């Protein structure tokens, strides 16, 4: 030990604010709290990691395993130092040696990596990194492409059975077996998180509360250690363990000694949590989870779940669902919105207090247009949530759908309510023209549900005609909600099937582009993970929208509606 500090272990309640003050003024409290924890601990000898026959086995000499808790390999007689591998056993909130902090194997080390997985009887590998970063290699690829099917590393034969590529991580299902040994194949689970930058942090803390949700779910048929590794086996990896461990700690004592725990970590493995940001990440991780909890229902249980989520027993009280919706932290004046509020540009907003955040408004190649970028399930795919153009922007509207190369447009409104215009009419029967571009409606197909108009677009630079589809859902007043939902869904079938997957292809609008457009965007995203995972986190999906535009799902009616349709369209 040395002289660090004595930080008071945060209790649930005060966590939210403790956090708030701890971060104030570029979070210098945190900075020091973190700057006090030593890189390494000089007492714990490190004499094996430094031997010569073992120096090619490391990736960076900056990070070396302590001698006392270093993971050892079966000594292969003859081969000098054939017991060393860069990896350290890590203790959890309780379970001692719950994890194994491993440095990403080197090509010169792949074999020794799979040997450690066989010997320690691990059945869960948590890879938090990418093999390549900055045209610099961070981790050798130690597994068979789904295509080569099987590959043996030394005596360890690894056969892949599944490769499920999700938005942030890819989950593989491997089967290993030692072949110079009658023992039988074991079921290995390998998650790879790809939305986590070396030396840095992910886009949102929920992404971490996410893979933690996933790993704590996998089978560990052998009570073996959990292999967590990145490039050096200290940064992102140690950070992960931070969240995981400290989250058990919360669910148990309702307090968390992050500072303490990280020290315990820098005591088991050199410079674990390596960044003030990663340090703060663990906290936000905790704050966020404690704050909103776990809101991700699986398709298996969606129906039963919701039902009770709706029952609000003492009727004198709200429902569990309502509870949730009320937890949804609307991001009021969340970020800068100056642009949309400039003099001349104030007359370009159908709805005054529905201005895109300066942080994502759509640049009008700048120039001002009241539409903003909305995140898509598959990142980085993106949608454009705009408002019904104004007869005084009917032009700019088209210039946007061109520059941004919009393929399909979705109109959720009518053209007006008797007198009151709910939208302009950016399209005519003729060959309408606006600025450097001219539209030309080619087909107008109406159905009892929605009506589809095919446009052909061009600018004086002819022989480029870009066909643009517009779908117009009628059945949906800013009063009621989708009258016949089942068809609002089909509306989405055709829409998604007219978009070419993985280049902004889509654009969705309505009066203000938040009112109904919110429910739409929310559905597209929930429908996607609903297909690619069978898991649905309506809360977070909505929490993201609110974070992008003032307006999305603002009423419980709408909120509860997401649950209804997601549920009813999956018995």
């Amino acid at each position: 030990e040395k002289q660090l500090m004595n930080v008071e272990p945060i209790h649930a309640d005060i966590l939210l604010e403790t956090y708030k003050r701890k971060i104030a003024d570029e979070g210098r409290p945190f900075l020091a709290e973190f700057q006090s924890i030593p890189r390494v601990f000089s007492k714990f000898p490190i004499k094996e990691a430094r031997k010569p026959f073992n120096q090619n086995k490391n990736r960076y000499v900056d990070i070396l395993p302590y001698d006392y808790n270093r993971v050892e390999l079966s000594e292969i007689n003859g081969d000098a130092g054939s017991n060393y591998i860069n990896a350290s056993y890590i203790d959890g909130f309780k379970e001692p040696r719950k994890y194994i902090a491993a440095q990403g194997p080197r090509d010169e080390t792949v074999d020794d990596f799979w040997r450690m997985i066989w010997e320690q009887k691990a059945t869960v590998i948590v890879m938090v990194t990418r093999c390549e970063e900055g045209n610099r290699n961070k981790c050798a690829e130690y597994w068979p492409s789904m295509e080569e099917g099987t590959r043996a590393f030394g005596d360890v034969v690894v056969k892949i059975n599944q490769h499920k590529r999700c938005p942030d991580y890819i989950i593989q299902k491997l089967n290993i077996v030692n072949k110079k040994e009658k023992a039988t194949g074991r079921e290995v689970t390998h998650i790879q998180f790809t939305s986590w930058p070396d030396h840095g942090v992910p886009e949102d803390p929920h992404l971490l509360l996410k893979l933690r949700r996933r790993v704590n779910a996998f089978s560990n048929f052998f009570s073996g250690p959990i292999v967590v590794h990145s490039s050096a086996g200290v940064g992102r990896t140690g950070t992960y363990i931070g969240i995981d461990a400290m989250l058990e700690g919360l669910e148990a004592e309702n307090k968390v000694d992050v500072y303490g725990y990280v020290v315990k970590l820098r005591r088991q493995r050199c410079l674990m949590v390596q960044v003030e940001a990663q340090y703060i990440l663990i906290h936000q991780a905790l704050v966020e989870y404690n704050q909103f909890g776990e809101t991700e229902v699986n398709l298996s249980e969606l129906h039963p779940y919701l039902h009770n989520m709706k029952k609000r027993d003492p009727p004198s009280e709200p429902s569990p669902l309502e509870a949730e919706f009320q937890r949804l932290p609307s991001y009021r004046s969340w970020r800068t919105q100056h642009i949309g509020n400039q003099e001349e540009n104030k007359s370009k907003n159908r709805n005054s207090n529905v201005i895109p955040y300066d942080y994502n408004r759509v640049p009008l190649k700048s120039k001002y247009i009241n539409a903003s970028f909305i995140m898509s399930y598959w990142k980085p795919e993106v949608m454009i949530a705009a408002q019904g153009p104004l007869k005084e922007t009917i032009g700019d509207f088209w210039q946007m759908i061109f520059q941004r190369k919009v393929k399909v447009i979705v109109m959720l409104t009518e053209l007006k309510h008797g007198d009151q215009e709910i939208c302009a009419q950016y399209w005519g029967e003729g060959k309408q023209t606006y600025g450097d571009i001219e539209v030309d409606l080619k087909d107008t197909d109406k159905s009892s549900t929605y009506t589809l108009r095919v446009f052909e677009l061009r600018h004086s630079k002819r022989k480029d005609s870009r066909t643009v589809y517009q779908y117009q859902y009628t059945n949906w007043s800013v009063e009621q909600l989708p009258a016949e939902p089942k068809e609002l869904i089909s509306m989405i079938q055709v829409v998604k099937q007219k978009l070419p997957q993985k280049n902004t292809p889509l654009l969705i609008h309505c009066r203000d582009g938040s009112q109904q457009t919110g429910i739409f965007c929310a559905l597209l995203n929930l429908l996607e993970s609903a297909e690619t995972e069978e898991v649905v986190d309506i809360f977070q999906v909505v929490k993201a929208l609110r974070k992008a535009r003032l307006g999305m799902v603002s009423t419980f009616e709408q909120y509860q509606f997401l649950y209804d349709v997601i549920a009813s369209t999956y018995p």
């Binding site: 900056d62 940064g235 390596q274």
Partner: peptide, 4 residues
């Protein structure tokens, strides 16, 4: 090499 070096991790920093």
């Amino acid at each position: 090499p070096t991790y920093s």
